[PDB]
Every structure is written in structure tokens, then in C-alpha cells.
Scaffold this active site. Sequence first.
Site, PDB file in Angstrom:
ATOM      1  N   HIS A 109       0.809  -1.236   0.000  1.00  0.00           N
ATOM      2  CA  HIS A 109       0.000   0.000   0.000  1.00  0.00           C
ATOM      3  C   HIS A 109       0.846   1.293   0.000  1.00  0.00           C
ATOM      4  O   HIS A 109       0.360   2.353  -0.421  1.00  0.00           O
ATOM      5  CB  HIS A 109      -1.093   0.026   1.094  1.00  0.00           C
ATOM      6  CG  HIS A 109      -0.640   0.545   2.428  1.00  0.00           C
ATOM      7  ND1 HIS A 109      -0.437  -0.277   3.518  1.00  0.00           N
ATOM      8  CD2 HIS A 109      -0.380   1.807   2.858  1.00  0.00           C
ATOM      9  CE1 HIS A 109      -0.045   0.452   4.554  1.00  0.00           C
ATOM     10  NE2 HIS A 109      -0.004   1.722   4.181  1.00  0.00           N
ATOM     11  N   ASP A 155      -0.623  -7.380   1.826  1.00  0.00           N
ATOM     12  CA  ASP A 155       0.043  -6.072   1.904  1.00  0.00           C
ATOM     13  C   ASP A 155       1.574  -6.239   2.031  1.00  0.00           C
ATOM     14  O   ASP A 155       2.123  -6.057   3.119  1.00  0.00           O
ATOM     15  CB  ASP A 155      -0.490  -5.240   3.092  1.00  0.00           C
ATOM     16  CG  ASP A 155      -0.176  -3.741   2.965  1.00  0.00           C
ATOM     17  OD1 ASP A 155       0.362  -3.315   1.916  1.00  0.00           O
ATOM     18  OD2 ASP A 155      -0.475  -2.973   3.914  1.00  0.00           O
ATOM     19  N   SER A 185       4.063   2.714   8.574  1.00  0.00           N
ATOM     20  CA  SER A 185       3.656   1.626   7.670  1.00  0.00           C
ATOM     21  C   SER A 185       4.812   1.160   6.775  1.00  0.00           C
ATOM     22  O   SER A 185       5.573   1.995   6.308  1.00  0.00           O
ATOM     23  CB  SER A 185       2.472   2.052   6.793  1.00  0.00           C
ATOM     24  OG  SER A 185       1.318   2.240   7.580  1.00  0.00           O
ATOM     25  N   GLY A 186       4.903  -0.161   6.529  1.00  0.00           N
ATOM     26  CA  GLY A 186       5.993  -0.762   5.735  1.00  0.00           C
ATOM     27  C   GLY A 186       7.248  -1.080   6.562  1.00  0.00           C
ATOM     28  O   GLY A 186       8.153  -1.805   6.077  1.00  0.00           O
TER      29      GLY A 186
HETATM   30  C1  LIG Z   1      -8.737   0.944   9.166  1.00  0.00           C
HETATM   31  C2  LIG Z   1      -7.536   1.372   8.291  1.00  0.00           C
HETATM   32  C3  LIG Z   1      -7.985   1.413   6.836  1.00  0.00           C
HETATM   33  O1  LIG Z   1      -8.118   2.512   6.313  1.00  0.00           O
HETATM   34  N1  LIG Z   1      -8.211   0.236   6.172  1.00  0.00           N
HETATM   35  C4  LIG Z   1      -8.704   0.317   4.788  1.00  0.00           C
HETATM   36  C5  LIG Z   1      -8.175  -0.810   3.891  1.00  0.00           C
HETATM   37  O2  LIG Z   1      -8.377  -2.073   4.525  1.00  0.00           O
HETATM   38  C6  LIG Z   1      -7.608  -2.189   5.717  1.00  0.00           C
HETATM   39  C7  LIG Z   1      -8.015  -1.125   6.736  1.00  0.00           C
HETATM   40  N2  LIG Z   1      -6.929   2.667   8.723  1.00  0.00           N
HETATM   41  C8  LIG Z   1      -7.707   3.858   9.080  1.00  0.00           C
HETATM   42  C9  LIG Z   1      -6.672   4.917   9.499  1.00  0.00           C
HETATM   43  C10 LIG Z   1      -5.317   4.191   9.514  1.00  0.00           C
HETATM   44  N3  LIG Z   1      -4.209   5.024   9.003  1.00  0.00           N
HETATM   45  S1  LIG Z   1      -2.854   5.380   9.841  1.00  0.00           S
HETATM   46  O3  LIG Z   1      -3.188   6.288  10.878  1.00  0.00           O
HETATM   47  O4  LIG Z   1      -1.972   5.840   8.809  1.00  0.00           O
HETATM   48  C11 LIG Z   1      -2.209   3.967  10.607  1.00  0.00           C
HETATM   49  C12 LIG Z   1      -2.458   3.753  11.994  1.00  0.00           C
HETATM   50  C13 LIG Z   1      -1.841   2.519  12.354  1.00  0.00           C
HETATM   51  C14 LIG Z   1      -1.852   1.941  13.646  1.00  0.00           C
HETATM   52  C15 LIG Z   1      -1.188   0.712  13.878  1.00  0.00           C
HETATM   53  C16 LIG Z   1      -0.515   0.074  12.798  1.00  0.00           C
HETATM   54 CL1  LIG Z   1       0.283  -1.455  13.051  1.00  0.00          CL
HETATM   55  C17 LIG Z   1      -0.497   0.655  11.517  1.00  0.00           C
HETATM   56  C18 LIG Z   1      -1.162   1.901  11.274  1.00  0.00           C
HETATM   57  S2  LIG Z   1      -1.268   2.748   9.812  1.00  0.00           S
HETATM   58  C19 LIG Z   1      -5.591   2.847   8.826  1.00  0.00           C
HETATM   59  O5  LIG Z   1      -4.736   2.061   8.440  1.00  0.00           O
END
Ligand SMILES: C[C@@H](C(=O)N1CCOCC1)N1CC[C@H](NS(=O)(=O)c2cc3ccc(Cl)cc3s2)C1=O
Lengths: 52, 234
Positions: free
Chosen positions: B42, B88, B185-186
Site C-alpha cells: 500500500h 500487503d 507503515s511498511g
Molecule cells: C482501518 C484502516 C484502513 O483505512 N483500512 C482500509 C483498507 O483495509 C484495511 C483497513 N486505517 C484507518 C486509518 C489508519 N491510518 S494510519 O493512521 O496511517 C495507521 C495507523 C496505524 C496503527 C497501527 C498500525 Cl500497526 C499501523 C497503522 S497505519 C488505517 O490504516
Amino acid sequence: KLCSLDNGDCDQFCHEEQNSVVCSCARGYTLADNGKACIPTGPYPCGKQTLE
Amino acid sequence: IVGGQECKDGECPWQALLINEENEGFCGGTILSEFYILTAAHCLYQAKRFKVRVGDRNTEQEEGGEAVHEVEVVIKHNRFTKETYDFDIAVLRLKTPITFRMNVAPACLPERDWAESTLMTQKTGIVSGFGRTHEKGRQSTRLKMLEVPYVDRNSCKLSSSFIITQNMFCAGYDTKQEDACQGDSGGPHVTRFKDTYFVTGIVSWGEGCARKGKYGIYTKVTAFLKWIDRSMKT
Ligand SMILES: C[C@@H](C(=O)N1CCOCC1)N1CC[C@H](NS(=O)(=O)c2cc3ccc(Cl)cc3s2)C1=O
Ligand SMILES: [Ca+2]
């Protein structure tokens, strides 16, 4: 028993073959003469924090 | 990273940072060998052109170990889906090799069965990155690390508003204020065994950062070991 008892005394990977433990190592390490310890082949082996 | 501690000199040498055209980090990676970086699929949709930086712990000063590398090839899993973040995972081949030194070294790839029975049944793993220090805060100028407990799979599934596929696992805390966050992330999820650190996951997604009743979701690297091996041969 075997790999369930303290990782079969292996430093890294443990595998059970015919009621017996077999140890092995990540890429960049060679298995020691005792068949258990893992020795780094060269500088900066994988998985080690750096000190100098 | 919310909570946790700064990585001290030499403690997180497998950390990579993906940087955009403006030299700003937007995602992490893990050094696997002199030519390869592991990251999240992603992350590739978050910048047109990017490079990879290694050997850095403080983005405001020059420490002497920093190196920037150009990407030759991007290898993304063909089954990756944006709707669920299933599969992912991606591997990057660099144009020039990484010269290992203080703060620059690879993490070990484990074997599947031993990792699942012995590494993933340990109490905790370690996550790291330059991501946000609070859900709504700014990115960290310092590289951080955090010890995170493995979470029971059934509990994780009950807590989630989104599907947890066979290619994901959960880690972190129910209510304590410690978690990964945006920009991490990553990045690496690693497990220590007799003072050697093995790759066990890739920072993937989460419903906010450190929210009560919510956990951090990671790509399950052990499901992808043969895939990773193929990618590193071409
Ligand atoms: C629920 C998920 C999301 O948008 N999804 C859509 C696609 O299908 C999977 C979930 N989501 C909503 C906001 C979040 N973005 S983020 O703040 O960049 C992020 C928070 C977070 C916490 C802990 C981990 Cl391990 C990774 C990430 S990274 C995130 O990844
Ligand atoms: Ca620096």
C-alpha cells in the site's frame, strides 16, 4: 520433548526428524562443530545489533 | 510510534525510510540484504517517485552513517487489494548495494514452521519507525522502537470493524497508550531470540493509533517466505 524442550538446545532453527533434533542457521551463518551453535561467516551478519 | 523509546546507537540497524521528492519520509522498510528492502504494497500508492534512506536516527543532524539509494525494480504482490489490505507486501531491488556499517545491517529471515511455533509464541515483538508520536501529532524527527505483545487471534477478530485475513496478525495493547501510527507503515516488526533478531511482520494498518479496544495489524511475513525468496532471485 525434542524441539519443545528449550528449542532442542539449538541457537536458531530446530527441526524434528525421526524422534531426533536437527539444528540449522539463517543465511550468512554456518552450523558449529557441536551441531547446535551458529557462527557468522563474515562482517555484519543478519540479526545482530551493531557495536563498532 | 506512540510511546516506546528512542533507538540508541546501533540498536535498530535494519530500519529503512522511504522518502519523497521533497526528502520527507512517508513509510518504512526493512533491510533484508545488500540489494533488497521489504515494505508494504500500500506504500507504493503514496508517492510518484521515491528513494530509500538507511543509517539515519535523527533527521535534523548528520551523524555520518546516512546513505540514500535509488530503486531499480518494484516487486508488488499481484494479489494485493486496497479494499481489505490483504497481501500487503512488496520487495524493492536497489540500483547500488548497501555498504553495511554501524547503524546499517540486515534482519534475518526465519523458516516458517519454527517462526510460527517458537517466535510468534514469545511474549513480545518490536516495532520501529519515524511515524507520528500521537494520532493527531506530527512525524518524529527521531527513530523510535516499541515492544508490543502478541495478541490472541480470536480477541483481535472480535475487536475489529474490518476483516482479519489469514495473511494478518495482531499486536499491541487493549488500553495502554503505546502503538505504531501514521508514517510507520511498511516498517519492521522483529522478534528477538537468543540475541538475534528475525523479521516477523510488516507494519500494515489500524483504526487510529493506540485506541482503547483496538490493536495494530501486521502483514504475516511467515505466510510469504517462499514468495520473498523468489522475489530476491530476480
Ligand atoms: C482501518 C484502516 C484502513 O483505512 N483500512 C482500509 C483498507 O483495509 C484495511 C483497513 N486505517 C484507518 C486509518 C489508519 N491510518 S494510519 O493512521 O496511517 C495507521 C495507523 C496505524 C496503527 C497501527 C498500525 Cl500497526 C499501523 C497503522 S497505519 C488505517 O490504516
Ligand atoms: Ca541524520
